[PDB]
Protein backbone atom coordinates (compact mmCIF):
# COMPACT_ATOMS: atom_id res chain seq x y z
CA UNK A 1 0.00 0.00 0.00
CA UNK A 2 0.87 3.68 -0.58
CA UNK A 3 0.86 6.15 2.36
CA UNK A 4 -2.61 6.70 3.83
CA UNK A 5 -3.96 8.89 6.57
CA UNK A 6 -7.12 9.19 8.72
CA UNK A 7 -8.00 12.69 10.17
CA UNK A 8 -10.85 14.15 12.21
CA UNK A 9 -11.40 17.90 12.44
CA UNK A 10 -13.61 19.93 14.77
CA UNK A 11 -14.62 23.56 14.22
CA UNK A 12 -16.25 25.64 16.98
CA UNK A 13 -17.63 29.12 16.20
CA UNK A 14 -18.77 31.55 18.96
CA UNK A 15 -21.55 34.14 18.05
CA UNK A 16 -22.12 32.75 14.51
CA UNK A 17 -23.66 34.84 11.67
CA UNK A 18 -26.95 33.45 10.26
CA UNK A 19 -26.33 30.30 8.19
CA UNK A 20 -23.07 29.38 10.03
CA UNK A 21 -23.04 26.32 12.38
CA UNK A 22 -21.71 26.72 15.93
CA UNK A 23 -19.97 23.26 15.58
CA UNK A 24 -18.76 21.12 12.66
CA UNK A 25 -16.85 17.79 12.68
CA UNK A 26 -15.64 16.07 9.52
CA UNK A 27 -13.56 12.93 9.08
CA UNK A 28 -11.16 12.24 6.17
CA UNK A 29 -9.30 9.29 4.76
CA UNK A 30 -6.65 11.02 2.61
CA UNK A 31 -8.48 13.68 0.44
CA UNK A 32 -11.86 11.88 0.84
CA UNK A 33 -14.58 13.05 3.27
CA UNK A 34 -15.97 10.05 5.20
CA UNK A 35 -18.18 11.39 8.07
CA UNK A 36 -19.88 14.68 8.93
CA UNK A 37 -21.74 16.28 11.84
CA UNK A 38 -22.94 19.77 12.60
CA UNK A 39 -24.83 21.57 15.36
CA UNK A 40 -27.69 22.25 12.82
CA UNK A 41 -28.46 18.59 11.78
CA UNK A 42 -27.18 17.12 15.12
CA UNK A 43 -26.61 13.76 13.26
CA UNK A 44 -23.43 11.82 12.44
CA UNK A 45 -23.63 11.00 8.68
CA UNK A 46 -21.42 9.20 6.12
CA UNK A 47 -19.92 11.32 3.28
CA UNK A 48 -18.61 8.33 1.25
CA UNK A 49 -20.90 5.55 -0.19
CA UNK A 50 -18.43 2.85 1.07
CA UNK A 51 -18.84 4.26 4.67
CA UNK A 52 -22.67 4.09 4.43
CA UNK A 53 -22.56 0.48 3.01
CA UNK A 54 -20.07 -0.97 5.59
CA UNK A 55 -20.99 0.72 8.91
CA UNK A 56 -24.27 -0.48 10.47
CA UNK A 57 -26.83 2.07 11.85
CA UNK A 58 -25.61 1.45 15.48
CA UNK A 59 -22.24 3.13 14.54
CA UNK A 60 -24.08 6.34 13.35
CA UNK A 61 -26.42 6.29 16.41
CA UNK A 62 -23.41 5.93 18.74
CA UNK A 63 -21.27 8.67 17.12
CA UNK A 64 -24.31 11.01 16.94
CA UNK A 65 -24.35 10.89 20.80
CA UNK A 66 -20.59 11.37 21.21
CA UNK A 67 -20.58 14.28 18.76
CA UNK A 68 -23.49 15.91 20.71
CA UNK A 69 -21.29 15.73 23.83
CA UNK A 70 -18.14 16.85 21.92
CA UNK A 71 -20.18 19.79 20.58
CA UNK A 72 -20.97 20.77 24.25
CA UNK A 73 -17.29 20.33 25.34
CA UNK A 74 -16.04 22.55 22.43
CA UNK A 75 -18.62 25.37 23.18
CA UNK A 76 -17.34 25.49 26.81
CA UNK A 77 -13.55 25.29 26.00
CA UNK A 78 -14.00 28.22 23.52
CA UNK A 79 -15.76 30.31 26.29
CA UNK A 80 -12.86 29.60 28.73
CA UNK A 81 -10.36 30.56 25.97
CA UNK A 82 -12.09 33.86 25.16
CA UNK A 83 -12.20 34.59 28.92
CA UNK A 84 -8.42 33.92 29.13
CA UNK A 85 -7.75 36.37 26.23
CA UNK A 86 -10.41 39.00 27.26
CA UNK A 87 -11.97 38.50 23.77
CA UNK A 88 -15.53 39.21 22.67
CA UNK A 89 -17.52 38.49 19.54
CA UNK A 90 -16.90 35.68 17.07
CA UNK A 91 -13.79 33.55 17.53
CA UNK A 92 -12.96 30.05 16.24
CA UNK A 93 -11.69 26.90 17.94
CA UNK A 94 -10.34 23.95 15.91
CA UNK A 95 -8.95 20.52 16.63
CA UNK A 96 -7.25 18.06 14.31
CA UNK A 97 -6.58 14.45 15.33
CA UNK A 98 -5.16 11.80 13.05
CA UNK A 99 -2.68 9.19 11.94
CA UNK A 100 -0.70 8.01 8.96
CA UNK A 101 0.20 4.51 7.75
CA UNK A 102 3.42 4.92 5.73
CA UNK A 103 4.53 2.62 2.83
CA UNK A 104 7.38 1.00 4.96
CA UNK A 105 4.74 0.17 7.65
CA UNK A 106 5.83 2.81 10.18
CA UNK A 107 3.14 5.16 11.62
CA UNK A 108 2.60 8.77 12.74
CA UNK A 109 -0.01 10.32 15.00
CA UNK A 110 -0.89 13.96 15.57
CA UNK A 111 -3.31 15.81 17.80
CA UNK A 112 -3.41 19.64 17.77
CA UNK A 113 -5.49 22.71 18.58
CA UNK A 114 -5.91 26.15 16.99
CA UNK A 115 -7.48 29.35 18.32
CA UNK A 116 -8.66 31.80 15.60
CA UNK A 117 -6.93 29.63 12.92
CA UNK A 118 -3.52 29.87 14.69
CA UNK A 119 -1.46 27.12 16.42
CA UNK A 120 -2.42 26.93 20.12
CA UNK A 121 -1.55 23.42 21.58
CA UNK A 122 0.35 20.46 20.04
CA UNK A 123 0.47 17.05 21.67
CA UNK A 124 3.78 15.23 21.88
CA UNK A 125 2.78 11.58 22.32
CA UNK A 126 6.46 10.50 22.82
CA UNK A 127 7.04 12.59 25.97
CA UNK A 128 3.25 12.67 26.78
CA UNK A 129 3.24 16.44 26.91
CA UNK A 130 1.54 19.46 25.33
CA UNK A 131 3.45 22.21 23.51
CA UNK A 132 1.88 25.63 24.31
CA UNK A 133 2.38 28.72 22.05
CA UNK A 134 1.68 31.40 24.76
CA UNK A 135 0.80 31.96 28.46
CA UNK A 136 -2.92 31.23 27.78
CA UNK A 137 -1.98 27.96 26.02
CA UNK A 138 0.46 27.25 28.91
CA UNK A 139 -2.38 27.57 31.50
CA UNK A 140 -4.49 25.00 29.53
CA UNK A 141 -1.47 22.62 29.09
CA UNK A 142 -0.83 22.69 32.91
CA UNK A 143 -4.39 21.39 33.51
CA UNK A 144 -4.29 18.79 30.65
CA UNK A 145 -0.86 17.39 31.81
CA UNK A 146 -2.25 16.82 35.41
CA UNK A 147 -4.41 13.89 34.06
CA UNK A 148 -1.75 11.19 33.36
CA UNK A 149 -4.46 8.58 32.35
CA UNK A 150 -5.87 10.93 29.68
CA UNK A 151 -2.31 11.38 28.18
CA UNK A 152 -1.91 7.55 28.11
CA UNK A 153 -5.35 7.14 26.56
CA UNK A 154 -4.45 9.73 23.84
CA UNK A 155 -1.20 7.92 23.01
CA UNK A 156 -2.96 4.53 22.79
CA UNK A 157 -5.68 6.03 20.51
CA UNK A 158 -3.12 7.69 18.19
CA UNK A 159 -0.85 4.61 17.91
CA UNK A 160 -3.33 1.69 18.00
CA UNK A 161 -6.97 2.77 17.66
CA UNK A 162 -6.50 5.27 14.80
CA UNK A 163 -4.31 2.83 12.77
CA UNK A 164 -6.90 0.01 13.22
CA UNK A 165 -9.78 2.37 12.08
CA UNK A 166 -7.76 3.54 9.05
CA UNK A 167 -6.93 -0.11 8.04
CA UNK A 168 -10.70 -0.89 8.23
CA UNK A 169 -11.64 2.15 6.07
CA UNK A 170 -8.85 1.35 3.54
CA UNK A 171 -10.44 -2.11 3.05
CA UNK A 172 -14.05 -0.67 2.90
CA UNK A 173 -13.01 2.01 0.38
CA UNK A 174 -10.46 -0.18 -1.46
CA UNK A 175 -11.89 0.45 -4.99
CA UNK A 176 -11.53 4.25 -4.51
CA UNK A 177 -8.50 4.66 -2.24
CA UNK A 178 -6.21 1.90 -3.52
CA UNK A 179 -6.90 2.57 -7.27
CA UNK A 180 -4.47 4.36 -9.73
CA UNK A 181 -5.39 6.73 -12.56
CA UNK A 182 -2.14 7.52 -14.40
CA UNK A 183 -1.64 11.17 -15.47
CA UNK A 184 -2.08 12.60 -18.95
CA UNK A 185 1.00 14.78 -19.40
CA UNK A 186 1.82 17.19 -22.25
CA UNK A 187 4.57 19.86 -22.70
CA UNK A 188 3.36 23.13 -24.31
CA UNK A 189 5.83 25.59 -25.89
CA UNK A 190 5.08 29.30 -26.55
CA UNK A 191 6.98 32.51 -27.40
CA UNK A 192 5.65 34.93 -24.72
CA UNK A 193 7.26 38.47 -24.16
CA UNK A 194 9.55 39.07 -27.26
CA UNK A 195 12.65 36.83 -27.01
CA UNK A 196 11.17 34.76 -24.13
CA UNK A 197 9.93 31.18 -24.62
CA UNK A 198 7.72 29.59 -21.93
CA UNK A 199 7.66 25.79 -21.33
CA UNK A 200 4.52 24.47 -19.59
CA UNK A 201 4.23 20.89 -18.38
CA UNK A 202 0.61 20.02 -17.58
CA UNK A 203 -0.79 16.86 -15.97
CA UNK A 204 -4.40 15.81 -15.50
CA UNK A 205 -6.71 12.85 -14.92
CA UNK A 206 -4.55 11.40 -12.14
CA UNK A 207 -5.38 9.67 -8.86
CA UNK A 208 -3.96 9.71 -6.13
CA UNK A 209 -3.17 13.52 -5.97
CA UNK A 210 0.44 12.77 -4.94
CA UNK A 211 2.60 13.58 -8.03
CA UNK A 212 6.23 14.74 -8.44
CA UNK A 213 6.88 17.25 -11.27
CA UNK A 214 10.19 18.87 -12.11
CA UNK A 215 11.99 20.48 -15.06
CA UNK A 216 15.57 19.33 -15.87
CA UNK A 217 18.38 20.92 -17.97
CA UNK A 218 20.55 18.35 -19.86
CA UNK A 219 19.77 15.52 -17.35
CA UNK A 220 20.66 17.53 -14.18
CA UNK A 221 18.45 19.86 -11.99
CA UNK A 222 17.44 23.26 -13.52
CA UNK A 223 19.01 25.86 -11.13
CA UNK A 224 16.46 28.42 -12.58
CA UNK A 225 13.02 29.77 -11.46
CA UNK A 226 10.26 27.10 -11.82
CA UNK A 227 6.62 28.07 -11.29
CA UNK A 228 4.32 25.41 -9.85
CA UNK A 229 0.59 25.09 -10.21
CA UNK A 230 -1.47 23.67 -7.37
CA UNK A 231 -2.77 20.12 -7.39
CA UNK A 232 -6.39 20.98 -8.12
CA UNK A 233 -9.46 18.74 -7.95
CA UNK A 234 -11.03 18.25 -11.39
CA UNK A 235 -14.43 17.29 -9.81
CA UNK A 236 -14.54 13.62 -11.00
CA UNK A 237 -12.19 12.10 -8.34
CA UNK A 238 -9.07 12.94 -10.40
CA UNK A 239 -6.59 15.89 -10.21
CA UNK A 240 -4.52 18.35 -12.29
CA UNK A 241 -1.22 20.20 -11.84
CA UNK A 242 1.46 21.95 -13.91
CA UNK A 243 5.06 23.27 -13.76
CA UNK A 244 6.55 26.02 -16.01
CA UNK A 245 10.02 27.39 -16.96
CA UNK A 246 11.84 29.69 -19.57
CA UNK A 247 14.74 29.10 -22.05
CA UNK A 248 18.14 20.23 -23.56
CA UNK A 249 14.94 20.72 -21.42
CA UNK A 250 12.81 17.90 -20.09
CA UNK A 251 9.77 17.62 -17.80
CA UNK A 252 9.97 14.73 -15.25
CA UNK A 253 6.81 13.32 -13.71
CA UNK A 254 6.57 10.66 -10.98
CA UNK A 255 3.17 9.14 -10.14
CA UNK A 256 2.46 5.83 -8.28
CA UNK A 257 5.85 4.16 -9.07
CA UNK A 258 5.92 5.18 -12.72
CA UNK A 259 8.52 7.72 -13.97
CA UNK A 260 7.78 9.80 -17.07
CA UNK A 261 10.13 12.07 -19.08
CA UNK A 262 8.99 14.65 -21.66
CA UNK A 263 12.01 15.94 -23.74
CA UNK A 264 11.75 19.34 -25.60
Amino acid sequence: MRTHSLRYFRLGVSDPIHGVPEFISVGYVDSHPITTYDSVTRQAEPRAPWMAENLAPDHWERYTQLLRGWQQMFKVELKRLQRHYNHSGSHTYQRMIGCELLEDGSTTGFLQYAYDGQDFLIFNKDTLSWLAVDNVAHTIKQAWEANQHELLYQKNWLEEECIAWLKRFLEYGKDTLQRTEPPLVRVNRKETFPGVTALFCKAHGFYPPEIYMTWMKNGEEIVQEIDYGDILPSGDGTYQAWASIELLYSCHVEHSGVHMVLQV
Partner: antibody
Amino acid sequence: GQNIDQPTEMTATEGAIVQINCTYQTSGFNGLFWYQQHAGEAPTFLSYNVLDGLEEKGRFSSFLSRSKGYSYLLLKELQMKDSASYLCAVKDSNYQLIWGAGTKLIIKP
Amino acid sequence: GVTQTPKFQVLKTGQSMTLQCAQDMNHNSMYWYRQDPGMGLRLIYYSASEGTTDKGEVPNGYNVSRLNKREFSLRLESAAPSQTSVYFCASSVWTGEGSGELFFGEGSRLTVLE
Protein backbone atom coordinates in the same frame (compact mmCIF):
# COMPACT_ATOMS: atom_id res chain seq x y z
CA GLY B 1 -16.69 -5.11 22.03
CA GLN B 2 -18.14 -8.60 22.65
CA ASN B 3 -16.89 -10.53 25.73
CA ILE B 4 -15.16 -10.08 29.14
CA ASP B 5 -14.31 -13.08 31.38
CA GLN B 6 -13.27 -13.08 35.04
CA PRO B 7 -13.70 -15.92 37.65
CA THR B 8 -17.06 -16.08 39.58
CA GLU B 9 -15.34 -16.57 42.93
CA MET B 10 -11.90 -16.59 44.59
CA THR B 11 -10.81 -17.57 48.12
CA ALA B 12 -7.42 -16.84 49.73
CA THR B 13 -6.00 -16.55 53.29
CA GLU B 14 -5.60 -13.31 55.29
CA GLY B 15 -2.10 -11.80 55.06
CA ALA B 16 -1.44 -13.45 51.69
CA ILE B 17 -1.73 -12.44 47.99
CA VAL B 18 -4.52 -12.91 45.40
CA GLN B 19 -4.47 -12.15 41.60
CA ILE B 20 -7.88 -11.54 39.92
CA ASN B 21 -7.58 -12.10 36.17
CA CYS B 22 -9.61 -10.47 33.44
CA THR B 23 -9.65 -11.53 29.81
CA TYR B 24 -11.34 -9.41 27.15
CA GLN B 25 -12.32 -10.02 23.52
CA THR B 26 -13.42 -6.65 22.17
CA SER B 27 -13.59 -4.68 18.94
CA GLY B 28 -11.20 -1.88 19.87
CA PHE B 29 -9.59 -1.01 23.16
CA ASN B 30 -9.57 2.32 24.94
CA GLY B 31 -8.90 1.10 28.47
CA LEU B 32 -9.64 -1.42 31.19
CA PHE B 33 -11.14 -0.48 34.57
CA TRP B 34 -11.33 -2.16 37.95
CA TYR B 35 -14.07 -1.48 40.43
CA GLN B 36 -14.48 -2.69 44.02
CA GLN B 37 -18.08 -3.49 45.06
CA HIS B 38 -18.70 -4.32 48.75
CA ALA B 39 -21.85 -6.44 49.36
CA GLY B 40 -24.89 -4.11 49.33
CA GLU B 41 -22.79 -1.03 48.37
CA ALA B 42 -22.09 0.85 45.11
CA PRO B 43 -19.03 0.08 42.88
CA THR B 44 -16.03 2.39 43.50
CA PHE B 45 -13.21 3.05 41.03
CA LEU B 46 -9.91 1.30 41.75
CA SER B 47 -7.78 1.55 38.65
CA TYR B 48 -7.46 2.32 34.89
CA ASN B 49 -5.03 0.77 32.35
CA VAL B 50 -4.76 1.45 28.62
CA LEU B 51 -1.01 0.73 27.90
CA ASP B 52 1.18 -2.27 28.91
CA GLY B 53 2.62 -2.25 32.41
CA LEU B 54 1.76 -2.51 36.06
CA GLU B 55 0.46 0.42 38.21
CA GLU B 56 0.49 0.25 42.07
CA LYS B 57 -1.95 2.15 44.42
CA GLY B 58 -0.80 0.80 47.80
CA ARG B 59 -1.73 -2.87 48.41
CA PHE B 60 -3.59 -2.82 45.02
CA SER B 61 -1.77 -3.34 41.71
CA SER B 62 -3.18 -3.43 38.19
CA PHE B 63 -1.49 -4.98 35.19
CA LEU B 64 -2.32 -4.81 31.48
CA SER B 65 -1.12 -6.91 28.53
CA ARG B 66 -2.73 -5.41 25.47
CA SER B 67 -1.23 -8.21 23.29
CA LYS B 68 -2.47 -11.17 25.42
CA GLY B 69 -5.80 -9.33 25.93
CA TYR B 70 -5.60 -9.62 29.67
CA SER B 71 -5.33 -7.76 32.92
CA TYR B 72 -5.07 -8.64 36.58
CA LEU B 73 -5.87 -6.97 39.85
CA LEU B 74 -3.28 -7.99 42.49
CA LEU B 75 -4.08 -7.65 46.19
CA LYS B 76 -1.14 -7.88 48.70
CA GLU B 77 -1.17 -8.33 52.55
CA LEU B 78 -4.86 -9.48 52.40
CA GLN B 79 -7.14 -8.06 55.06
CA MET B 80 -10.66 -9.20 55.91
CA LYS B 81 -12.03 -5.78 54.59
CA ASP B 82 -10.89 -6.83 51.05
CA SER B 83 -13.85 -9.34 51.06
CA ALA B 84 -15.87 -7.82 48.21
CA SER B 85 -16.72 -8.24 44.52
CA TYR B 86 -14.22 -6.98 41.87
CA LEU B 87 -15.68 -5.86 38.60
CA CYS B 88 -13.69 -5.60 35.44
CA ALA B 89 -14.81 -3.30 32.58
CA VAL B 90 -13.34 -2.49 29.11
CA LYS B 91 -14.04 0.57 26.92
CA ASP B 92 -14.37 -0.62 23.26
CA SER B 93 -13.62 1.28 19.93
CA ASN B 94 -16.85 3.29 20.37
CA TYR B 95 -16.15 4.13 24.10
CA GLN B 96 -18.94 1.81 25.33
CA LEU B 97 -18.25 -0.06 28.62
CA ILE B 98 -18.34 -3.91 28.50
CA TRP B 99 -18.68 -5.34 32.03
CA GLY B 100 -17.52 -8.67 33.44
CA ALA B 101 -19.95 -10.65 35.69
CA GLY B 102 -17.68 -9.78 38.70
CA THR B 103 -15.38 -11.81 41.03
CA LYS B 104 -16.50 -12.35 44.62
CA LEU B 105 -13.37 -12.50 46.83
CA ILE B 106 -13.59 -14.49 50.10
CA ILE B 107 -10.82 -14.10 52.68
CA LYS B 108 -10.14 -16.91 55.15
CA PRO B 109 -9.01 -15.45 58.55
CA GLY C 1 -21.14 13.10 44.80
CA VAL C 2 -24.04 11.18 43.13
CA THR C 3 -27.41 11.08 45.02
CA GLN C 4 -30.10 8.60 43.92
CA THR C 5 -33.56 7.98 45.46
CA PRO C 6 -35.41 5.85 46.70
CA LYS C 7 -33.03 3.34 48.35
CA PHE C 8 -35.91 0.77 48.49
CA GLN C 9 -39.29 0.39 46.78
CA VAL C 10 -42.06 -2.22 46.58
CA LEU C 11 -44.23 -2.08 43.47
CA LYS C 12 -47.33 -3.86 42.19
CA THR C 13 -47.36 -5.03 38.53
CA GLY C 14 -48.58 -2.24 36.22
CA GLN C 15 -47.52 0.55 38.59
CA SER C 16 -45.44 3.47 37.34
CA MET C 17 -42.19 4.53 39.10
CA THR C 18 -39.67 7.36 38.74
CA LEU C 19 -36.12 6.95 40.08
CA GLN C 20 -34.22 10.23 40.81
CA CYS C 21 -30.55 10.97 40.30
CA ALA C 22 -28.52 14.11 40.92
CA GLN C 23 -24.79 14.90 40.84
CA ASP C 24 -23.11 18.12 41.96
CA MET C 25 -19.76 17.34 40.32
CA ASN C 26 -20.26 19.22 36.96
CA HIS C 27 -20.37 15.93 35.05
CA ASN C 28 -21.80 15.84 31.54
CA SER C 29 -22.43 12.09 31.15
CA MET C 30 -25.09 10.17 33.15
CA TYR C 31 -26.14 6.51 33.11
CA TRP C 32 -28.78 4.15 34.39
CA TYR C 33 -27.59 0.58 35.11
CA ARG C 34 -29.26 -2.48 36.51
CA GLN C 35 -27.36 -5.17 38.46
CA ASP C 36 -28.78 -8.68 38.35
CA PRO C 37 -27.12 -11.71 39.97
CA GLY C 38 -24.67 -13.70 37.82
CA MET C 39 -24.06 -11.07 35.12
CA GLY C 40 -22.26 -7.79 34.52
CA LEU C 41 -23.93 -4.38 34.85
CA ARG C 42 -26.44 -3.75 32.07
CA LEU C 43 -26.95 -0.23 30.78
CA ILE C 44 -30.61 0.75 30.41
CA TYR C 45 -30.17 4.35 29.19
CA TYR C 46 -27.43 6.91 29.15
CA SER C 47 -27.15 10.67 28.61
CA ALA C 48 -23.74 11.65 26.98
CA SER C 49 -24.41 15.38 27.78
CA GLU C 50 -27.23 17.79 28.68
CA GLY C 51 -29.76 17.84 25.85
CA THR C 52 -29.40 14.22 24.67
CA THR C 53 -30.20 10.66 25.81
CA ASP C 54 -29.97 7.22 24.15
CA LYS C 55 -30.92 3.57 24.70
CA GLY C 56 -28.42 1.15 26.16
CA GLU C 57 -28.35 -2.65 26.19
CA VAL C 58 -31.79 -3.11 27.96
CA PRO C 59 -34.18 -0.09 27.36
CA ASN C 60 -37.57 -2.02 27.08
CA GLY C 61 -39.89 -1.13 29.98
CA TYR C 62 -38.09 2.16 30.67
CA ASN C 63 -37.73 5.75 29.57
CA VAL C 64 -35.40 8.51 30.87
CA SER C 65 -35.35 12.22 31.19
CA ARG C 66 -32.21 14.37 31.28
CA LEU C 67 -33.94 17.29 33.13
CA ASN C 68 -30.68 19.36 33.25
CA LYS C 69 -26.87 18.97 33.75
CA ARG C 70 -27.46 17.72 37.32
CA GLU C 71 -30.49 15.38 37.01
CA PHE C 72 -31.31 12.22 35.07
CA SER C 73 -34.41 10.33 36.13
CA LEU C 74 -35.45 6.80 35.17
CA ARG C 75 -39.08 5.93 34.68
CA LEU C 76 -40.79 2.46 34.76
CA GLU C 77 -44.11 2.92 32.83
CA SER C 78 -45.90 -0.32 33.77
CA ALA C 79 -43.72 -2.18 36.29
CA ALA C 80 -43.18 -5.87 35.57
CA PRO C 81 -41.72 -8.60 37.90
CA SER C 82 -38.63 -8.97 35.54
CA GLN C 83 -37.86 -5.30 36.52
CA THR C 84 -37.19 -6.48 40.17
CA SER C 85 -33.49 -5.54 40.46
CA VAL C 86 -30.82 -3.22 41.92
CA TYR C 87 -30.56 0.00 39.95
CA PHE C 88 -27.53 2.21 39.78
CA CYS C 89 -27.12 5.69 38.54
CA ALA C 90 -23.66 6.92 37.58
CA SER C 91 -21.89 10.00 36.25
CA SER C 92 -18.57 10.65 34.47
CA VAL C 93 -17.05 14.02 33.38
CA TRP C 94 -17.48 13.10 29.63
CA THR C 95 -17.88 10.10 27.24
CA GLY C 96 -15.64 9.74 24.13
CA GLU C 97 -12.84 9.92 26.74
CA GLY C 98 -11.06 6.69 27.61
CA SER C 99 -9.68 7.27 31.15
CA GLY C 100 -12.66 8.98 32.90
CA GLU C 101 -14.16 6.71 35.59
CA LEU C 102 -17.76 6.23 36.73
CA PHE C 103 -19.11 7.66 40.00
CA PHE C 104 -22.03 5.56 41.28
CA GLY C 105 -25.07 6.40 43.39
CA GLU C 106 -25.97 4.27 46.45
CA GLY C 107 -28.41 2.06 44.44
CA SER C 108 -32.21 1.50 44.39
CA ARG C 109 -33.52 -1.92 45.48
CA LEU C 110 -36.78 -2.47 43.56
CA THR C 111 -39.26 -5.30 44.07
CA VAL C 112 -42.20 -5.82 41.71
CA LEU C 113 -44.99 -8.22 42.74
CA GLU C 114 -48.40 -9.27 41.23
